[PDB]
Design a protein around this ligand. Structure first.
Ligand SMILES: Cc1cc2nc3c(=O)[nH]c(=O)nc-3n(C[C@H](O)[C@H](O)[C@H](O)COP(=O)(O)OP(=O)(O)OC[C@H]3O[C@@H](n4cnc5c(N)ncnc54)[C@H](O)[C@@H]3O)c2cc1C
Ligand SMILES: Cc1cc2nc3c(=O)[nH]c(=O)nc-3n(C[C@H](O)[C@H](O)[C@H](O)COP(=O)(O)OP(=O)(O)OC[C@H]3O[C@@H](n4cnc5c(N)ncnc54)[C@H](O)[C@@H]3O)c2cc1C
Lengths: 583, 583
């Protein structure tokens, strides 16, 4: 029979294995082999070093599955609304199909976030009366969302940008309107050749940009990504929907994809295996035949024997592809082979995204100190009918955003109250990295070989805890000395997504790319090599999706490959929902 | 005879060859082989694509050696004062020995820089009148240098940090004083295990940090580097002396090193060859024998036949070492070899510096428009006794500093007037990189393969020119609509030092490292590998020096290797001038 070989048991690799079995492509006598560098707990407590999978990681306080948790990776989704044709269609279908719809609950955010900006405390509702301390006339008396909407409208002009298909079309054909007013960018400029931050800066000045970057919601991006995509994803008509989470953590989706793939496989007669602590080391082609070597987690740089498959999925992000491509880039390859990942067009299209570093600090407290009556500036989390919101609080500090999960347990365990502290952006990666080593210690692991998130959230250093509490004191009291008022966390851990093999929290389409052409053609990179024999070697994952920073994008690129290159019947209604953009 | 093999004809590699011949270490019958990936113009017009060498590049307008020029890489040095024992000793001795001392001119800076901060225009002398628009009480009425000095004093306490030797000792043993007042850092903490930004932010708050980062200009350095080295380099006691430049360009130092080494080698009977467009591909050891492969610049990832030498200098920065290390990291190495750059201890010590990305835009004007009588906020460049100062103007924009070189031409009838625009820091690299491609064009070269600085300054795009003129209009007119008043540049070019093979403008010692032990021991990396046979394979350059961001550091590490490992008599007086820190 046929062997399907999947490198990476993140969302995209797990989803691919699940669809091949349940969708009926794999048949009795077929083999699905899944290889994962890490060691995720797919088989209950003690079966791994952290819950699956890749950048999704639910972290239970005390590694106690009955406790409060904080999502130490991705945390929420947008429920599919088929009547609106909007939301995360494949995540919603997959949650339903796995029997987890019963566990879906509201992820409520405050309508009135606290803003801590240039040593001022302003609840967002109060901006008309307490203007933000930014020299941006007009804009500083409105939520940052108003300025995002205004800049998007200066870019999109009269172009239709309400539907996912209209949005996809803008990426490739969107032009600055004939009325664009700039010294820098002429009217009718191709918006996909413009940096979002560059044009935001041009149109609103440094103070408008800084206000938007500091006071914008967690949806709002502001990095110098593709201005065509950023305008349609930051504008009034941005893709929206009700935020949900999966009670008990997003990670159970990945446990269930694995368990339910294994049970469907047994019924179907399909051999489905997961081989962990085992990475793809090197990959190349001999015509249609994929050649590859594996390496152990213990010795990740030294390849085993050369293996072959006819069907290989690289279910891994750019920084993970880079480490594989490095293993053949400098090598004398066998006669008649194609070093596919290092081909000029492949390397060029892999640069069609820019990377955003992220670090998350997860702190559990024995009480919800942020609700105390004497807290000068508490987060406004209280809702009349349904429960307390999760925040955020939004700041111009290195600690960019705070969410307050509090007790999200079934209520059975000893109540701990969780806080998620967000550090993001190239500006701050060097700031947070030195907090990762004890103040009494020297660095011991080369930075590029510290696979921290792959292993699991790492114990926060005393320096890192004290820095978070100092920041939370300035946010909630406006007095750095109030850090002494905050009770010491009962557990504190972190995830630094800038470290290999992830190399990014998020990917964002780059300026100077035809996004649809990359989304379409990078998936089967032999199509980027003039004269090459087609091979079933695929790149999948959120990075080169139309839903970056969502599991939805990992599912959509994987679905699009099964449809386009395996002729599978999609589980989606794609009538109004292209899995990826068509050109 | 004895063969010396030098990889990298930047300042360190050139200096090394020069000292080996003129110091009489290389004798009749010996060979010195120099390899350079680039194609620098060592032999006048038509002999390369840019003037030598590495990150020093003098750029003449219109490629006219009689026209005005801007330094498109390193631009100034501190003259050695042997009376006080302060300044760049080896650079000053080298310029004298090469017969270039007659070209040394003051590089004067204004004592009244224009500050453009949060849309306010403040000449620094007027901060008592018009406090900086930062919520940092008291600090905002005084130059940022005062805040830098006060933070340095909070870190150093009573410790002597006056001399180069005492500063070196502070790197390894310096502790926060008993009086240190912090929630985050205990009194007596090892300063070398603290990030400078981390502790500046702890002591001065985000608004004090932002003011220092935005208004410090000159050589101030707020990145999150080793706080022990940052405190002694940013404080009262910081290394000083008189700033100079080389009239006609710093590049002539490197032209003269090459030409005078060649003439001295011919007189001495030493075979001295420079082989350009030819890079080190891979390196490793067999006992004491250095094994290597070369690659052509045309095909930089493919090695040729294995070559051996007994004496090898890697005269290249971290990002360059990384590319060579990638070529063996994943390889199945010959029996009996040591893959020296990938050894754990070597990799760990290579991470003993952090990287600061830098982009320089060089613009030539047909007139000094910034001196026009109708300019609202002209720079205060005059000096009653002598030629104008060079600025800078200092801002909180992506364009963080402006230098005004004006007419430094030597004999053209039609002089141009030069302006240097500085973009720096991890915050802004993704902002400036999208300006490097025409707004009508897609990216065509993968970003990690675009060796722009190696080839020479690149023509500024129309978008990049317009972006700079917009920023200059905000700065000097306080109105972005005034950009139309600035004459379009005669020529505009850029150098993006973030690109390979440089991967940094600047290196800075990292927190959580014993700087002296790295500085000493990385030079001969076999000493970081337990059980390794000692080999004459050396790492030299500014990056692991005690003078990072100066040519002086390139010369000092090279000189330290010649003294410590080849028994040469130093040209320096080291009485008050350790070449590198001693532990
Ligand atoms: C801070 C943060 C917050 C997020 N929040 C949300 C959110 O709220 N909702 C949401 O839906 N999404 C969220 N996301 C995004 C979500 O995490 C990603 O979209 C998703 O994890 C992408 O899945 P993937 O399979 O493409 O990649 P990954 O999750 O990156 O998985 C790739 C896998 O490949 C493995 N791998 C790498 N190299 C090799 C190799 N050589 N051999 C074998 N295996 C290898 C990795 O170890 C990993 O398991 C968030 C992400 C971050 C970082
Ligand atoms: C924006 C800027 C401003 C600066 N200002 C000043 C200043 O005012 N004054 C000052 O004194 N210094 C200044 N410097 C610093 C100065 O440029 C450096 O200290 C100096 O260039 C370091 O010399 P080096 O030989 O260590 O390395 P580099 O100058 O980086 O030279 C390394 C050489 O190695 C070559 N190479 C790399 N890989 C290979 C390979 N595999 N095989 C062969 N060759 C290879 C490179 O092409 C290059 O020629 C500045 C730097 C920058 C970026």
């Amino acid at each position: 029979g046929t062997t399907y070989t999947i490198f990476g048991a993140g969302p995209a690799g797990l989803y691919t294995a699940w669809r091949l079995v349940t969708g009926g492509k794999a048949v009795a006598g077929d083999t699905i082999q899944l290889y994962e560098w890490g060691d995720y707990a797919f088989d209950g407590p003690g079966s791994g070093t952290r819950l699956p999978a890749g950048r999704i990681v639910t972290h239970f306080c005390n590694d106690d599955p009955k406790q409060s948790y904080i999502e130490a990776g991705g945390m929420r989704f947008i429920e599919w609304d088929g009547t609106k044709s909007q939301g995360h269609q494949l995540v919603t279908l997959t949650i339903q199909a796995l029997g987890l719809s019963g566990k879906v609950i509201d992820f409520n955010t405050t309508d009135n976030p606290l803003l801590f900006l240039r040593e001022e405390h302003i609840y967002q509702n109060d901006l008309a009366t307490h203007p933000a301390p930014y020299n941006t006339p007009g804009n500083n008396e409105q939520p940052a969302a108003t300025l995002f909407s205004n800049i998007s409208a200066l870019i999109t002009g009269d172009a239709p940008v309400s539907t996912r298909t209209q949005q996809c079309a803008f990426y490739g054909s969107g032009r600055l309107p004939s009325t664009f007013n700039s010294f820098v960018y002429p009217p009718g400029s191709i918006a996909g050749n413009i940096g979002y931050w560059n044009v935001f800066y041009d149109q609103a000045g440094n103070e408008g940009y800084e206000y938007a970057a500091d006071a914008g919601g967690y949806t709002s991006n502001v990095i110098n990504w593709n201005a065509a995509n950023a305008a349609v994803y930051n504008g009034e008509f941005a893709p929206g929907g009700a935020f949900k989470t999966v009670n008990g953590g997003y990670s159970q989706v990945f446990v269930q994809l694995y368990q339910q793939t294994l049970a469907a496989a047994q019924e179907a007669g399909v051999a489905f295996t997961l081989t962990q602590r085992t990475r793809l080391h090197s990959v190349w082609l001999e015509d249609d035949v994929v050649n590859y070597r594996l390496a152990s987690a213990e010795n990740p740089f030294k390849g085993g024997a050369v293996q072959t498959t006819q069907n290989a999925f690289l279910a891994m992000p750019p920084a993970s592809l880079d480490l594989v491509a490095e293993a053949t880039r400098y090598a004398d390859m066998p006669e008649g082979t194609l070093d596919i990942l290092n081909a000029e067009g492949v390397q060029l299209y892999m640069d069609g995204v820019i990377r955003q570093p992220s670090m998350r600090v997860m702190l559990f407290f024995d009480r919800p100190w942020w609700t105390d009556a004497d807290v000068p500036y508490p987060p406004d989390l209280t809702s009349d009918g349904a429960p307390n919101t999760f925040g955020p609080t939004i700041t111009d500090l290195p600690l960019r955003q705070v969410y307050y999960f509090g007790n999200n347990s079934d209520g059975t365990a000893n109540p701990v109250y969780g806080v998620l502290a967000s550090y993001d952006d190239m500006q701050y990666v060097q700031f947070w990295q030195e907090l990762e080593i004890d103040v009494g210690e020297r660095r011991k692991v080369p930075i590029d070989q510290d696979y921290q998130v792959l292993f699991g959230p790492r114990k926060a250093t005393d320096t890192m805890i004290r820095m978070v509490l100092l920041e939370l004191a300035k946010v909630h009291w406006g007095d750095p000395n109030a850090a002494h008022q905050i009770p010491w966390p009962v557990e504190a851990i972190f995830n630094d997504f800038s470290l290999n093999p992830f190399g990014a929290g998020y990917h964002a389409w780059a300026a100077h790319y035809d996004i649809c052409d990359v989304m379409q053609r990078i998936r089967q990179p032999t199509g980027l090599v003039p004269g090459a024999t087609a091979a079933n070697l695929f790149i999948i994952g959120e990075a080169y999706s139309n839903d970056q920073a969502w599991v939805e994008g990992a599912f959509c690129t994987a679905e699009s490959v099964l449809v386009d290159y395996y002729g599978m019947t999609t589980i989606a209604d794609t009538t109004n929902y292209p899995l990826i953009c068509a050109c």
